[model samples]
Target chain A: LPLTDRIALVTGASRGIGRAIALELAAAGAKVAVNYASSAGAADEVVAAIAAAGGEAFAVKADVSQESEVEALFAAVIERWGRLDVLVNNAGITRDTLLLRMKRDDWQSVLDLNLGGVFLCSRAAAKIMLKQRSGRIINIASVVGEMGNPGQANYSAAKAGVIGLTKTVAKELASRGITVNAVAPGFIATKLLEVIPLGRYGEAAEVAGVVRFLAADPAAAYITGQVINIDGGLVMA
Target chain B: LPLTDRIALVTGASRGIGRAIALELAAAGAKVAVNYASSAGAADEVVAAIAAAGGEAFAVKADVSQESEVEALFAAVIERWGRLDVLVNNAGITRDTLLLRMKRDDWQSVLDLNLGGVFLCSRAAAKIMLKQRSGRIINIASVVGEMGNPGQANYSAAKAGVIGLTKTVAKELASRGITVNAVAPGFIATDMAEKLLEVIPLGRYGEAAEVAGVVRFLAADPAAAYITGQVINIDGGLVMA
Candidate 1:
């Protein structure tokens, strides 16, 4: 209930990490906008779950990469809630291929949606946040952004760009009382499985827990421009 | 000798760290393409020095930011030498001003040249490097980018952008034999060096040669194969992230 009455939007919220984040934030007393790209059925289930738990929620659809679509997505959120205090850019996809085999198809597809979507959503979020004089923007980055992974070049760049965007925008928006940070998860998969010392896959809820803290915790108010790792020791600082 | 017969391209090689990097790689026996945006005379001087030192090099003109020009730039390298083995994304500029005054314009000017230039060149380089199944793409970032500066948000964004691009290309192309990394140097004898001297633990301005040595190692050393997506700082311990 730390975020009581605050409005939050979680992109790609139908399943996996985004679903967990949407649920977690809603439980924390925030009215949630469950943004899904194509899965209306799963999105409806998530919203119904929140409503069943006595929370206010709704499903919104848009491909965050397209400028027009992102604008419409936010328009829907603002129309329903009147204000937005939290924005989580978490929608991403993979067409894994080696650089040699990658097409402009593979490379641009991942970058446009994964990285470009973050930029679009974050910018729209920033516009709202800067005026409100406060907000939280959390990007789902990856350890691959820090330590390279084979066969994920486009995804890696997009994630790395997210981190860089997190830092720069964090600085720019700090004076405006906005906080920006990245959550870099190690994964649900492997070196196919040998590289991680901890030898386990992190639950979607695990990522959601940290994100909820950053979104509503008083301690994280001062934290900005950081890439928090949840990779189970795949990368250690 | 590690780079014997290798072909390398160093952007902004007309002077400073780019100049030193070109000389270092050429000395190690790599033929170089010394790319200069506008300083043809200085680039010619660099090429002449390499020629005088018993190395092969030529100055090529192209704006690293423009797509067509960059295509020409890479094509010229392939035309002169059959293949490209090393690429140094070294061209950058500054329109230093506080963010409050006009951060947007500054970002536009610097971003187009620094970050955009790196992207165009790297993408072009990846095309060639992927074909070879082996190559090196080293970017020149700055400590200012890693840790922000008072009057340099533009440069910081651009430099940080390079670091991101480096790690991404590093991961994307690692399956092949190619490697990618960044060198983030601190105050290197530029006008800003004197003011930053006290902050630097070493209490000295970094020489152009200081940076070039690391670039040479990354481009030519067999030991560097396993290294990717790293930013090796040469800032005399000024910043530690």
Candidate 2:
């Protein structure tokens, strides 16, 4: 309930990890914008679920990797909601293949959508959040980024790069009262986790649980530039 | 060089990260005690290297996991240097096996040596550190502790336990000017990492010096005073957290 009346934007919220995050933030009292690339029906379902729970949400469409689309997405949120409080850059795609066989297109597409979406969204959010002198940016990175899976070189690089970017942005925004942190989920039990870490898949809700904690917990105020691992002790750092 | 004349002790300083840390601290002008359990010759070599570099170092023998030996180890440093400033708990061992095949001794021994060593050494250091109201304790943890390697359940539990302990101790000791932190190294190119290169993204293992550099920074940099309870990964971006 710490996030009462907060305005949150969750990218890729039509399904999977993104959907879980949107629900969790809404449960914590935030009015959410569930942004999806193409899953309009799924996004609408999220909005209805929030409404049924006496919370609020709206489905917005945007290709988060596109700058213009990202700007329009934020513009629409501010236009209706009047303020943007939390930005969860959870939109990501994986083009998993061994480096020897991976196409340049595979590499570019994954990075552009995964890491590029985080960058563009965070940049837009910072513009509003910095002016407001407050905000929380939680990026959903992967355990593959931290541990380096054999076939996920592109995803790994993007996630690892996100960590570095989180640190720099955390420092830059620290004085402005904006906090940037990343949650690196190990093998979550989505269509995603069973393919990685062969044992003990985590729940999408577990990762969302941490995202909610980071967003609303006062104890986390001093915790900037930190990457909290939600990987069931999968990756300890 | 900010550590000039600061008295320091490095457990398991005979080789690897411990050895590099010993040399690094000594080069920064902190007279170091090179500690070893059964590697006196290796410890002596590290001391000699420090000497050759015009830095100060001496060898000490102690089984860091044993309370009596740990107490004696700290006593030796205090008696010789007259004060202890930095304590690096870098001593550790591994007994790898699948969960079904791992014996109780394997689990206990790995935990006792790796995690237990840190606990004992840290407890001993904290007494001296708390009384002085100033000290730095750096525990060298591994990425496997965070990621849970298949054959290293014991090692993983111990290392993960160390991180929890680091955070708790950092909070408890913060007001005393005693900072406790852990450095989780991903895949440093030691004998321990030669078999694990395929999984690391850097296509190569990290150098011991890289780990040493971070330890030195934490000990010497004032900016790091606010950095307790944090694990800085020095793995070529191998592990992001």
Candidate 3:
């Protein structure tokens, strides 16, 4: 395992992309903290799945959008594992509506949860990783952020904002041995993705595989401030 | 302006990023051959700007999409400069329409000009570059290629294909000290980007000078030595990938 003894924290790990990221990190030999907002049952199942596969993992609950909850979530991980080597900000929500018809509440809710949650978690993770002088931060973005969708202005804005933050943080932490990058997943095989050119959606494990590559590949050490798109040639960038 | 003494051939140097690239390469002290398809007046302006700036430049005309024209274009450059160091495949045209309405001619025209031109020019340049054992081929791709657009299926496919070709050629030439890369510009500040500013996170289109900087960096910077087969976005953070 390339990540033997490393510790990874994946937010919104109750199911979907987050769950796959948690499982992949664990399979790579990292001790995983599977974070979920309210789906305790699903989160525990993920932990059980990891354990059944001979990996170390535990379920943790926290609303990643809330700063206090984010702090507490990180504290629990550090309290148990004593260190963090990777942080995956995979928790995100979408409020889809055309810009002209979008409600203010819908816009703010998506931004706070999607963009704000990444900021809070990355800030918390940076505190630990900076002192250790080595870490990896992977943010899950979307291709919609790059190519705006008709009814997803709010969601696209948040994801686009996340890309900017990824670059800023990558430059700031480069000297400290921490690599920050984003993965812009094109229409994945989840509840999302109504329209795509590939006539199909990408597998969650495919996105997880790219995350694992960035975290573990020695050849990728010098590659920071990059967004790797795992969207079946949907987005060449 | 770090390309001192380099010899660069920029296709479609009559205007926009192609014109800016020719001037930028010349400003960096490179001897530039400004190639234009039909705008001889505009091409001359680019060369004059370089000459006025005390840099060396000359205008050359060629429809880059034509195989015979492409061959003669590179031949002329080598005949005059005696060597070619950089090839910027910036010549391209667009035929925008929804996939349902896009014509066969529209698809072929855009692909032949954008993608095919790169192939023909690269093939000719590679012969000389391999002999010299050092060269740079920079393709001007678009962010739309990454994030597919509704009305630009043909342009998107061609630009995306150029990226795939960049990677294949980068690996093919890496052992010979040549680097091939693409610069994917998002909402550049030409007439073409007028409608895109409102949606861009940066709230404005990128200037041609910015694109020139990235192209020049890959050609000049030692830090980019290990960087190959990579597409750098210069869209003011529009596309992170």
Candidate 4:
């Protein structure tokens, strides 16, 4: 009933929005695999913070865009916890440039990591959970993806792909006994909020709030989700 | 705790999609008010069908586009059942012609019934349900409104308005314990018609019962309490977002 023994693997948990998600899941009683791409120090601090609050977490380094590293990432969690109950695809990047001026690297790098990471992690997570009967995969999206931003073509495209991927995967796995979901946010307090209809920015905690519900709540059992936007009325699309 | 004692009023219930909705609600144990514009015999037949199946329903006449008739329609339901826990705004009209070919009368007629009727029925239903503390309103929209069809500009506009209206009303009334939502059907084999299966991903026509099945959920499911302002497209993968 509780996430007490359930293990959740959260990618890009070293800083910012992903950091908040890691803490939130830990607080909800999940023993977490805190994944970082480049910052082991930040990942360790995240784990330490969880431990300080009487929750269990461990730091693991994996550039999730690399399929080999992702395999190892899941390997570590499955070896330690024996299985994964939830996978949060919070890892992402932004090579913000207008479409016309964008280089191939800018486009491919963003997609390789953001969209591609989800495929690697989600497919791996699904494989593990399918054998065990049920699990959850929650991908974090942005309102920029729902409604594009001027300078974020690559970032928006990748996130938009995640939104679509989240839908197809959910349909594919629902009959196979798993739940795939996503949450979209616009202008988190760290960045901007002027466009929000509620006239305020969302907290990282606010975005992470629904993540825990979709992953752990019994009430969300029948919630056939594509994505729920936490964007203060920013993207009605 | 169950829909057995709850009351539902479905407009356009004399035939087609609305009739299916009335039967579906009644089958799920809710008492239904079957509202029809001019088809008294058909309405009676629907009510008789429900009764024969051991469900309770009554046919009432109301041209929902007229404000006065809408008020009287609600009064009849209130007089008979005392409270309305669900209202399905399913009455709609389509004067389908290419936009340039359409007359002002064509546009206005469809808007008056499809869009105007929802406003009249929803506000009246909300007034009763708000005081009673909880209810559900499910507006029947269409895939054309979402993706747009060549000759259905008027119908599409009204259906699109219902989707938007569903969103705002859901926000307004969530605190009042009422949930508002809409369902958009695509290419259902009914009184309504459509084409170009080349576009529909699932390559099949939906049934009236398939649309009614979703209405039954909106009418009775307790999980529905957490849902609002959502336009569910039951279009066999024609629309996805």
Candidate 5:
């Protein structure tokens, strides 16, 4: 119940790490807005699970890349709750290709959704949060963003861009009492980790705990503009 | 003549990593400004050595924590050379003591130089570099900055603050084409290394050349443009991503 009365919106909340974040935020007493792109059933299940657990939740759908839909989604949240406190920019897609073969659309697609989504949502949240003088915006970036991996330039570029954006926004909002930070999860064991030969991907709960910790006020101050990794020491910083 | 027409300003250049960085950048053919606070004779000797090797060198004095002094130092460079290309914020000192036993001045002194010095110098450099629409601003931080150190709490905080400031400034200037990054060295073999070896027991301290190579590589425009807001560690795997 650390996040009692806190309002959190987790984009891409229908599955994997996003799903875990939504449920965990609910468990921590945050009233969650579970955002999904096309999985109405999955969103329903998440809301149902939280309701069964005596927590509050609601499902919202937005393509995120489309500006109107993005506006509509946040508008709905404000309509339901009067204000927004925390935002987890967790929705991301990987269109992997080596730099030589990487297409412009593939690159732009990721840049739009992964990096650009953070910009849109963070900018929207910042506009209002700056007035309130308090807010937390967490971007779910990846370790590959920090350490470049072969055959994932698009994904790498987008995540890296998000990091640069995270730091810049953190500085911009710091004086306003708003905190902006990132969590770069390394090799997490999820649907995404099934392809790795290293079989020992990080547990989802580990990343969730770090996220919960960041959302709380104790670890909230003095750690802005930093990326806290929750990958079993796989990503030290 | 890798850096044939480049102008590199390196602080703390009398000895240690700063000395090595100055030598290597000179070896690559850049005109070097070796800055020192209290070691004029030693700094001049290095300059003389560089000149003997057919490289250009000059020794300048500035305690970078002092804003006016830092500005005057850079102004001298621009006046002499007509342009400034690279600024390395490497001048730093430590007043290490246990946290409880750490006097306020000890903490404030370390912060003033290591952290506050970087802010002042970087602000001055960025004002000039951003208008030019091109520059390289590198700060010398440490692996201890990444991982918390017990006796070096002030040092750690300042160093960590360096990285924080690096990221903030990097963003402010990236669109203007001035890249800012940090090179974090770990347990390097310097007069300072003896004091840090109990924690690092790597059996030996890193040679200044190890850090110099990273700085040299970073000076190249190709390797630099996209590297803003990032800290690269040259600590023999002491700290990793």
Candidate 6:
């Protein structure tokens, strides 16, 4: 219960990496807000799993890119928990397209959700945490952001922009005792990896372990504005 | 003339690591500008030494912490040399004190000269280099910046700030065809190192020539282009993962 008395809000919690993060935070004794966009059924399943394991949690729904929806979601979280501590901005959608034939909508959409969502959540959380003199804003980025890949122009630019945002916000929040950083998951062994290289697909649990390390109190100092790769040494930066 | 046709400006060249950088860059064939703030004698000695060694060089006086002096120095360089290509923001001063006992002046002065100097010089060079669409701005930082030191609160902050500035400017100027990076020298056998590194992993100090080699590589166009926004440590791998 390292995170006992803490409140965690994880986006994209309906399934995949988001689900894993919510469960992990709950297991650590945090009051988890399992945020799901379109899958209320799956979100309830996650909340039930946490409760079954003797953990506290609730489901919140929001299309993270929609400012009004995001605000409503946070309002629900605040109405219940009274104070938010850890915000894992993991809400992202990929619209992979080649640069030559890429539509502006595709590019703009991913940036709007992934990068813009991070800025919005971080801005709001920083307002609360800055006054309290502490907070953690962890953006879930990918290896493709650090090392460019074919057919990921929209994804890469938006992801790379998150890194820029992470650094800028880290500097701004450092003095306020708030730590902002990014976790660039390499080839994680999630439902998404089918053609991912061998020994490259890090178990979803392995990815969770890295985030857990960052969230732990030992890492509270000295590690800010750094991107920790949970991707089996794929993009070692 | 190793840096043949290359033009380099080294700030704080009056003494210490800055002096070494000026001499080394001059040896590499660049027409070096040994910019000094206080010691004209030391600056002139370095200029004469470079010239006598069959290297082209001159001295310019400027306090890098002051924007006006920085502009004047660069203006003087443009008047004399016609172009600026490589800039080594090597000027730095340290006032060692614990954070609790450290005065505001100690913190502010170090920030101004060490970190702010890099910003001023790099920003100035960026304007010129952006026009040319090619340039190298190497800020000389230290290992202490990456890892915190007990009494070097201000120094570490400034050095660390330089690394941050380097990364930010690297992205800011990458499309404009300029490379901004930092060279972090660790345990170098300079007067500075003698007083500093009782805790260094290498157990011995590095030579000035060792630091020069890494600087030379960053100044090389072929290697320079691909390595923007990087802090290459010349620390004998002392500060490692």
Which is the leading candidate under DockQ?
Answer: 1
Model 5 chain A weakest 10-residue run by lDDT: A191-200
DockQ, 0 to 1 scale, candidate 4: 0.01
Candidate that would win on TM-score: 1
Better candidate by TM-score, 1 or 3? 1
* Reference-based TM-score of each model: 0.82, 0.52, 0.52, 0.53, 0.53, 0.55
- Candidate 5 lDDT at A120 equals 65
Residues B103-178 of candidate 2 have per-residue lDDT tens digits of: 5567557766776677567767777888888999898877765655556655665665566556656765788777
Clashes per candidate, residues 3 or more apart or on different chains: 1, 3, 1, 0, 0, 4
Q: Is candidate 1 or candidate 4 better by DockQ?
A: 1
> Superposing all C-alpha atoms, what RMSD in Å does each candidate have to the true structure?
4.0, 19.2, 17.8, 18.2, 13.1, 10.0
**lDDT of each residue in B86-203, candidate 1, tens digit only:** 9999998888764435434455667668876887788899999988999999999987667655556567756766787688778678788889999999888742135678889998
- DockQ values of all predictions: 0.22, 0.02, 0.02, 0.01, 0.03, 0.04
lDDT (0-100) at residue A199 of candidate 3?
Answer: 61
lDDT of each: 0.84, 0.78, 0.80, 0.80, 0.77, 0.75
CA shift of B170, model 2, Å: 0.3
**Model 5: lDDT of residue B16:** 84
Which of the two candidates, 4 or 5, achieves a greater lDDT against the reference?
Answer: 4
Off by over 4 Å in 5: A1-237, B191-203
Which docking class does model 1 fall in? incorrect
Sorting all predicted structures by lDDT, with the top scorer first, yields 1, 4, 3, 2, 5, 6
Per-residue lDDT of model 4, residues B142-227, tens digit only:
87666555566456656755665566567657777889888999888775335568678998888898999998987798888888
Query: How high is the DockQ of candidate 6?
Result: 0.04
**Model 5: lDDT of residue B120:** 68
Q: Which wins on TM-score, candidate 1 or candidate 5?
A: 1
User: How big an interface RMSD has model 4?
Assistant: 17.0
Residues A107-194 of candidate 1: C-alpha lDDT, one tens digit per residue: 6678668866776787688778877999999999888867766677667766776777677678778997788898998885324448
